[PDB]
Amino acid sequence: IYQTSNFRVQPTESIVRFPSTNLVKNKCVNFNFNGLTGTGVLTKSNKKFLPFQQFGRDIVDTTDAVRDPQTLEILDITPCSFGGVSVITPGTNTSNQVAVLYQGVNCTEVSVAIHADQLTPTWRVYSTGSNVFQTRAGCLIGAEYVNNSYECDIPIGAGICASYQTSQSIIAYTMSLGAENSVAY
């Protein structure tokens, strides 16, 4: 397994809310709240702001909340998804088909970015195929999840391995610790 590059989810449009378009939620979108620049996902929050406070601040230095200039609303700010990209492959002496693992993302967001907007992922022509399985380590594309147990061949994530089955294909499963046994005390 090798790590090659990184992927980013591009913004769709821009939002201006001077107290001048509408506002969009649950989308990686640019925004500008009276000089407050930056882009990200805006979702409603439950942080009871002070009557004279409008900004937000995380533990160290980054904004994580903002108040709507028009109506009294509290909503969060989240950076758009990013992460590394890994390629799973056997030797070229064996086959030429591969598998891709998007690290630390939910499969639904990747699927929407790929097959709905067709322009958000950084590597578009690079991105092909449709076989989706979701793991705790990220979204795995190009491998069929069997429900058997084998000795680990190519480690992937939290107890998930992959191998070249046998027609010939690439499978993903849960590794087997060992043979079951019980001595009769």
Binding site: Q3, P79, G178, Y185
Partner: protein
């Protein structure tokens, strides 16, 4: 004194603990996202430094691989996944606090639950990610349970080949035979000893959660990793001698030829920060690897067999050990043997009989004031002197300190 000796008349069973870190957090860094972000000019300027980042990526990848290798080496010692019989009777020994609990979905022993609920903790930065470990918590708990089941129902036989069954009291007698105490001591004190053992185990619980500084070693790793990550994140808001800490203001506040130097200063500062972080991580990884090697050795020697090294598997004469899983580490429960209730005695090196010196086979000559007896070293149990338990091998006019008495044939 040079004709006096002390011999214990009672013993004690004591249980201690030991905590060792095993692994640490795995992280990966993206240079362009961290240093530049979404600026083309910054990337073009950074391209002039060559290959300062492939080295960092390789070092971080090596650390990440070594972290998984450490846990694989420490815990994956056996291949068969042994199981314990449904009927939990072992001649009075109660293993409830260490065997897995069926009721809990986590399938963990109560002590493991205490450790997990005690340690606790301390997501997306600017180009900084954390990778999950290869082995989950349930798999580690399964390995620990398999080791416990192997060491309860088989003794040390499963560490050198096929597992061979044996009743538990006979295994304990074998283990007493390994420290210089005869078998009959256990069989005549089987009911008492077990009780002592049970009591010790209970105290262990009250000695873990009540004291807050017991599990400090495992908390230090998490605290240090979080501190390093927070420092690296917070370093991004420093001017480093330039006019601003934001690339956008520098770009859209001055002509490009002047902005080149301002961007270059920030590039140099952030490169220095990354290098410092990577070097510190490398040193800490080396230390953690040394600790993991020590933990693996202790697992191999104290758990899979009986050790004769002094103070290696606990204070006192070693008997056995039990492993428990902890976040980023392991915990050992050493069971030892301690003498008590000594007593004055008078001893002689040899016994003269018909002009012949007599030496004991396995024991020490001891006198209570009137009669002479031969007894084993580590437990007071006098015996009548006989030619069965002595060898002559000498004469009466050589040894210094000989005492002449009678030896019935």
């Amino acid at each position: 004194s040079n004709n006096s000796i002390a011999i214990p008349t009672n013993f004690t069973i004591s249980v201690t603990t030991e905590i060792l870190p095993v692994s640490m957090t795995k992280t990966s860094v993206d240079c362009t996202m961290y240093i530049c972000g979404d600026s083309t000019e910054c990337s073009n300027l950074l391209l002039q430094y060559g290959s300062f980042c492939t080295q960092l990526k390789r070092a971080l990848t090596g650390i990440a691989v070594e972290q998984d290798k450490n846990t694989q080496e420490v815990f994956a010692q056996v291949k068969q996944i042994y199981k314990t019989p449904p009927i939990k009777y072992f001649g009075g020994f109660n293993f409830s606090q260490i065997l897995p609990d069926p009721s809990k979905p986590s399938k963990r022993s109560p002590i493991e639950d205490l450790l997990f609920n005690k340690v606790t903790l301390a997501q997306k930065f600017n180009g900084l990610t954390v990778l999950p470990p290869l082995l989950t918590d349930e798999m580690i708990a399964q390995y620990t349970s398999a080791l416990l089941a192997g060491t309860i129902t088989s003794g040390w036989t499963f560490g050198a080949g096929p597992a061979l069954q044996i009743p538990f009291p006979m295994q304990m007698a074998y283990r007493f035979n390994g420290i210089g105490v005869t078998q009959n001591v256990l069989y005549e004190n089987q009911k008492l000893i077990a009780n002592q053992f049970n009591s010790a185990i209970g105290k262990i619980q009250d000695s873990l959660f009540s004291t807050p500084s017991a599990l400090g070693k495992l908390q230090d790793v998490v605290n240090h990793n979080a501190q390093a990550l927070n420092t690296l994140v917070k370093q991004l808001s420093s001017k480093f001698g330039a006019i601003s800490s934001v690339l956008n203001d520098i770009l859209s506040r001055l002509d490009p030829p002047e902005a080149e130097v301002q961007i270059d200063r920030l590039i140099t500062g952030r490169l220095q920060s990354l290098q410092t972080y990577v070097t510190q991580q490398l040193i800490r990884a080396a230390e953690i690897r040394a600790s993991a090697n020590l933990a693996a050795t202790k697992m191999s020697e104290c758990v899979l067999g009986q050790s004769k090294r002094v103070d290696f598997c606990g204070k006192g004469y070693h008997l056995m050990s039990f492993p428990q899983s902890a976040p980023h580490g392991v915990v050992f429960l050493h069971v030892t043997y301690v003498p008590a209730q000594e007593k004055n005695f008078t001893t002689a090196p040899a016994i003269c009989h018909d002009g012949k010196a007599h030496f004991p086979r396995e024991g020490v000559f001891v006198s209570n004031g009137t009669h002479w007896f031969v007894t084993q070293r580590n437990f007071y149990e006098p015996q009548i002197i006989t030619t069965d338990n002595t060898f002559v091998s000498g004469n009466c006019d050589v040894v210094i300190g000989i005492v002449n008495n009678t030896v019935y044939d």
